[PDB]
Amino acid sequence: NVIQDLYLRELKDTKLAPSTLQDAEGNVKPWNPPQKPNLPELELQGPEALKAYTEQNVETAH
């Protein structure tokens, strides 16, 4: 009765509400791509380090 009146009135008279995707964007985090896929740095090239190291530590066995 009154159930029908409200049901009818509500359903009919509102069935669109605001909904803008752009407004949503403000409220959410932005996708941005990773940075620095940097390849590892190469170090201690040559036996220069090794010859230095054999000499450098006097105690090679004591």
Binding site: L21, A24, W31, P33, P34, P37, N38, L39, P40, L42, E43, L44, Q45, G46, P47, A49, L50, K51, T54
Partner: protein, 58 residues
């Protein structure tokens, strides 16, 4: 994606992930330094080995 009702940004980040699906490529850098190190190391290793082996029999 089926949770989101605003889906057309889940399609965006899906495509961003699949775009950037290489997230960083291969690193093998131990192929120049490892061999140099190995030559000096091997030389010293063999020298010590031979010296003490000689001494053992002595």
């Amino acid at each position: 994606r089926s949770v989101l009702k605003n889906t057309s940004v889940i399609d965006k980040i899906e495509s961003y992930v699949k775009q950037y699906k290489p997230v960083k490529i291969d690193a093998s850098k131990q192929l120049q330094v490892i061999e140099s190190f190995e030559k000096h190391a091997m030389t010293n290793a063999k020298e010590t080995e031979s010296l003490v082996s000689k001494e053992l029999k002595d």
